[PDB]
Subunit: 499 residues, 4 copies
């Protein structure tokens, strides 16, 4: 006997032994007489187009694939529910927080960042942790990572960052000179790079890491009052990491380690769960906050802004078909129910457009009619019509223009957005010299003990050594600008690695 | 009060007069507060990206259109059923003919040929008359015209012919030179060209015209015995045409005459219906048939092959949304249940490839998952997975390879194709010189009377006069080769038209 | 002989009389021995798959069509040049205005609005007049109409307006109820609706109508100083209109009237040309302007802001292939070179996104690499890579991230935008009741004469009569709000039209 | 200093040191002023829509990815030439074999089979060895692997096989039950499974393995006489294979080993080259050949059919951009010039459709106008027009129909195909029971020595142990059918692996 994942077909058969197999048909439902031998004129003769059974099957095989995600391509998927445990209605009027005990079906997709579809799971990289809440007020997508921060704070640099993390445009190889020349030219990446090369850069699966909204969001209560918040959902299974040596063995031993881990866990009853906290920051506090409260390279410290518990995320169901239920998942940070709203964070502002845009390209214009993406607990009604692969009644004969004297849908005034005042020159403001070291200094000195610092500089050195010397010198200087010992320890290891 | 097509919204409001209007939501189901005014900074300021309400609607609007059909773009639709009235089980085992009284749902599309999505309905052209049967043995698509014959009898000429009948590649205008230079260089079009320019080239709507499969098809019964057959579905409302004078007036007074006529008839309960007939030709009749019995430019004379009734087609239901239920309709001649098989007709052999092919482009690789395209009265079980816009569970976690020892769907031996013997060189045989006149001489002399021959010639000269003299001179010869007086009458009207 | 357009093929043969015809190949360049007969086993045998000559040609015929434009689908195109005749460098620094006598290649496409690809040209509708300037500083797409104004002044109402102006979602018929219920619930359309139903609603071909940018734009000279502007290009051939009687006749006699008139004009040397003008409004004039200077239902009166001539637009070349050079043309209002910037107009702000978005859907992600869409007079260099249908070297092995220490493209500081100060609440401001009648009153009384007011009301009642009485009464009220005689005349005509 | 592949950007800067960096522009050619900061209202404000620089770039980033090859996704590319070195003009009239010394540009792509884009290169799997010849007679694609044979012999089993070799539809994991349940149930895979699991299952990169056409192909000379032939292109660098121990180390130390090995060789002048041979079988020898001479699981022994040299394949140029020149490479076995034709091989017959079909989806309808896919050594002329992303004149105003009296391209009679006589019932012949053991017994006994047989069984046991017992017992039987000692050795090791 083996693990549950290996016995998938065995159990699909046992769960069916009481029936007769189905008739094998064509896309059009036409039963097939023989689907092992093609229609030819004579045993050793050529093929006939009269063999549509072949053309119907081959033509579909030729179109099985779709474009993989531009980032976070390698992913795992599961399904569960979110249950409310405390009361934060004073901050948010979102239906998903209405009363204690409220359950909401969720869908979750873990993922790496840079690897393509076939890459390994146990590698140094951030981890995606997108969560989709199916509320009565529409879908709420919390597209979070395993880290509360990122490498940059402007969306215009994001394509550049991804291009620097992926393959060379001529050799198609992972290029160290592309990784560090970018990081060393943008020191604001110092904070997230220190997280990434720590022990938590390679989690022991998806069940032993936290998730974070990272972005500052906005919560609105029933009175129309607003506060800024962060989202933290911590693992109830405890932080656990893989060492460089073990993570490298599993890289070729089991490229799908975290995929097999998640599936076998839920199958054997071990339902992983996460505890959803929030930090809150009033509008007044945001004005005096030392750093920019909407800078994605900054955290709200815990001592000044403690964690407030909200509810639990539980995963208790596997997918039945991976492609239909995981590959075709689409999380839009633009999907936000009343009571939740975005902050002026430049990074989140770009994500408001990027995700719906790429989905219409990767999946299709009407990707929201795919089952797992549908807001199936909300009544979708508007004046949108047509588009490729329209799957419902297309809202039937309802008037397709607004306004109209024929009682088509109506706007709901209570769903208006919070009104905030802004004044200033419409202009591209230079955010490259916002504090790039302070919070990193605290992490290096006060969060990491001595052993962890030691492993931090060995992981960085082990990867930075491949770059050219002038890139090493620039990166080390940026590490010196955090702590003189931080840099000089990296430099020491580099002096050795350079023979 | 007006016709019921104009009172569509008025009736939609009335059927909703009780309940309240719905909550207008984004595609993600999030209710919108205000969708008549955009999110700006000040009353006269710029637009924000935060306005995801604007983005979500505009983006879908930007993606409303799909590629129209490469032919038969202007279309009218309706739905209904097919009821068997006579027993033809001795020729065919297709479940759709199982017993008298059995009903099978149908979906029909009426169309022109050459015009685009905005062309008038009352123009001189063939009429599409495609019928989709939803049988338990899958969908059966009888994709026929309002003519038993076509202009050509080899598929390789089809892209050419259609190019000739559409717009010049430079001027993007209807070019008579392109029209007649092809018809005159390929006199096989004589037969269908004679049909086209007579009185039935412009039918008074879609309810006053016949429908034919034109192709020779093969029927197979329960013993395995096979015969060839034609399909005729004759209008029970009576052949009724439009004059050239009335057709031109309606071309600008009501570009959507046929579309409106159909809708109003069904709405007021005046349901149109047709009577399906078949001709039967034994295998030994096909060897002695004076012409090529699979020639698409030929018919089977009624005297030697009478009409055998089968059942009734009845259209009693209008579309609720035109785009979802008619524009996305996909007919594949290769959708054939056991009991109905293709003949060696060179044209039909090509249509087995082109319709599923063009549909993967127009609609999508998984277009058979669109509700109106689905075979929703059969069980579609097979080893095809994935593809963009997968809309069911994608067959779950069923084994996806064949053969397997895990009890996935099996092949049904009874559904094997009837077996014919062929012998001959594999080469490109020349069919340009099959009798191109005989069956036209019969139509011109024995079917048409004095007045109908006169109008036939006038309609030809009224359009052939715009072609160069060398193209006219050749076309006239082909008409003289049918019957001398045929070319003389045409040439006598061209001598005048050329001043 | 005939007109030049009809003789398109005759002239293509003559221009090649000296050469031998080319060898006919597959798409892969493989010569074809025969393409009139299909590969079959024996003269009356089935078609083979070996016949790759058929599949290669048929597969591309099955994929010839693309989605038509979601608006302005029916169109006509030509090419030429823009020449500067007057100095306006004090206002703008755009290299297209640098010095008198400078020429810039242009590509123009005229169009209607609602009709699909097959509709007629001579119908009552606005007329598109897009102009693509190929500047050294990139393309400049002036996507104007044949009117200075529009029906709405907020982009969120644009999908709705279009839906109303197109076909009912159930009947697929032009619906007067949808037209006037919208126009009557949004009386800001009074201005443009009065333009549409006057004599200039149906121009005589595309050469006898003006072109306007419509939107307020911004110009920026070298010193950083900025003003607001309007772009008026007036026909050098004179305003000329078709009567309702003659527009209906041509609608069926020559649906492609405009298309044929443009081609024949250019082919006979009679090149149409326009005179580009601008208005100018200082930032201070904007602050006191009685109306909202960025309202798209408003014009800047001539007496207060007189026309300033700039240059000449001349169309002196016909497209060689229509699809490649006209159907695939893509104008992006967002394509603006330094010196030309957008105003805060709510509608223009929505057009900066809409056009590239839909062009990626209609043509493809890399649509800008199509020859006619390329900025083939600028050197495109940046960090964008890959995509479907990549056609060049993809900028080679250039560093694909930014910033970088390997001398890849750099930013040009002089090309920064003009900086404006805005202040106000971020909310959805209601503009529905901006003055809706004033400049319509002036138009009805001062601009039209007695005869023209008579025809304006006859055209309005002739089409409004088909709508429901409650919609009639509402629209007449809106017309009464412009001038009591305006609505009283329309009502007197509706009384008769209602028997 | 490092290897050439990692110094790619270093060399790109050096080859440009003389000139100054280009001006960074939008896609429309517009210079940007600042692309590191986004346009906002105040330094901590929201993002604007008129930031068309951000949207322009992001929208293209959102559309970087296309569907990966449904099989052979992981690949590496290089370019060179083919040079004739022996005269085989008595067999084939193909222009690529015209005379000794004739050179023809080529394009090659190496690949694995099952892994996705991100998988490792040094894994047990067949290898793709595709070659594209740019001949005057169009393009000739010899889409070959590194094996003369394949697992199956009927294309109706191909999508199945690939499904089993890839990921389970639910867990998305490699499934040893799917692998061997397919292989055990189809014993025709014995010949190739033995090849797969021998030392040549893992080659030391792409420069040390052979290439084969596998299929039987037809050659036709200038007189019209035909013969059947095989293509072998052996490596001039010598066969070299990785051990299971090292292959696994390199799977996590350098996932891209094969790609790096290729690029470094070319860049350093050590150009790899292959020697093309052919085997020849007359039509008479094909009637008496022991097995089916078109059975893809069968080779032609060298004693009865010796290799006949032809020429050399040389790779001397790396790609400049991987995506444009390798990811967009499309090989169609149907691309065959006069002198080379397909045989009745049931597997090749399916490919004649599958590759053009999938390319029109993966890349698009006009994928042949992509540079690297263009037959740029030939002159494409035909009556195919339009399509998404039409990139040249679209053949201008040339007549788009055929036949035509306007001197458009003509057919070349000499390019007609060879004519072969076929006779027999048109039906689906059962090929499951063609000799599945005779040629494998020769390989096991006579080709391999004592050591290799030992490692062959071990390699098989290591992977077969993971499958269920009832699949092991059946697989072992198929190996006992080849040789008792073959099945014995495997069973003895499976007895140990099952504890
Ligand atoms: C402006 C900055 C960013 C841009 C433009 C961007 C863009 C994208 C795009 C286009 C995708 C592909 C989505 C799909 O194909 O369905 C994606 C995936 C993803 N991104 Fe980002 N990203 C940004 C930053 C971030 C941030 C800040 C986070 C977390 C806080 C994040 C987490 C993720 C995750 C988890 C996924 C995978 C979602 C899934 O499972 O489908 N990204 N991103």
């Amino acid at each position: 006997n083996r693990d549950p994942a290996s016995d998938q077909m065995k159990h699909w058969k046992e769960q069916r032994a009481a029936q007769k197999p189905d008739v094998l048909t064509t896309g059009g439902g036409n039963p097939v007489g023989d689907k092992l031998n093609s229609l030819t004129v004579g045993p050793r003769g050529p093929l006939l187009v009269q063999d549509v059974v072949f053309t119907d099957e081959m033509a579909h095989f030729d179109r099985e694939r779709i474009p993989e995600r531009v980032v976070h391509a390698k992913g795992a998927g599961a399904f569960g529910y979110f249950e409310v445990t405390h009361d934060i209605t004073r901050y948010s009027k979102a239906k998903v927080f209405e009363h204690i005990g409220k359950r909401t079906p969720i869908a979750v997709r873990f993922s790496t960042v840079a690897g393509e579809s076939g890459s390994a799971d146990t590698v140094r990289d951030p981890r995606g942790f997108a969560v989709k809440f199916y509320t009565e007020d529409g879908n709420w997508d919390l597209v979070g990572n395993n880290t509360p921060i990122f490498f940059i704070r402007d969306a215009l640099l994001f394509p550049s960052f991804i291009h620097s993390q992926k393959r060379n445009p001529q050799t198609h190889l992972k290029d160290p000179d592309m990784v560090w020349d970018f990081w060393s030219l943008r020191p604001e990446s110092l904070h997230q790079v220190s997280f990434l090369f720590s022990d938590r850069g390679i989690p022991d699966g998806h069940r032993h890491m936290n998730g974070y909204g990272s972005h500052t969001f906005k919560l609105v209560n029933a009175n129309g009052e607003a506060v800024y918040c962060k989202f933290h959902y911590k693992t109830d299974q405890g932080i656990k990491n893989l060492s460089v040596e073990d993570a490298a063995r599993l890289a070729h031993e089991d490229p799908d380690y975290g995929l097999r881990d998640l599936f076998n866990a839920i199958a054997t009853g071990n339902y992983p769960s996460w505890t959803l906290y929030i930090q809150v920051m009033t509008f007044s506090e945001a004005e005096i906050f030392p750093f920019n409260p909407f800078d994605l390279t900054k955290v709200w410290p815990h001592g000044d802004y403690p964690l407030i518990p909200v509810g639990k995320l539980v995963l208790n169901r596997n997918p039945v078909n991976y492609f239909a239920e995981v590959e075709q998942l689409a999380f839009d940070p633009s999907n936000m129910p009343p009571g939740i709203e975005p902050s002026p964070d430049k990074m989140l502002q770009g994500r408001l457009f990027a995700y719906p845009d790429t989905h219409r390209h990767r999946l299709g214009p009407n990707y929201l009619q795919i089952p797992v993406n549908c807001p199936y607990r909300a009544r979708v009604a508007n004046y949108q019509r047509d588009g490729p692969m329209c799957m419902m009644d297309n809202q039937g004969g309802a008037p397709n223009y607004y306004p109209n004297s024929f009682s088509a849908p109506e706007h709901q005034p209570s769903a208006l957005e919070h009104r905030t005042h802004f004044s200033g020159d419409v202009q591209r403001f230079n955010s490259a010299n916002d504090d790039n070291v302070t919070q990193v200094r605290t992490f290096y000195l006060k969060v990491l003990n001595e052993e962890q610092r030691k492993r931090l500089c060995e992981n960085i050195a082990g990867h930075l050594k491949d770059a050219q010397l002038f890139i090493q010198k620039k990166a080390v200087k940026n590490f010196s600008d955090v702590h003189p010992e931080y840099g000089s320890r990296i430099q020491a290891l580099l002096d050795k690695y350079n023979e």
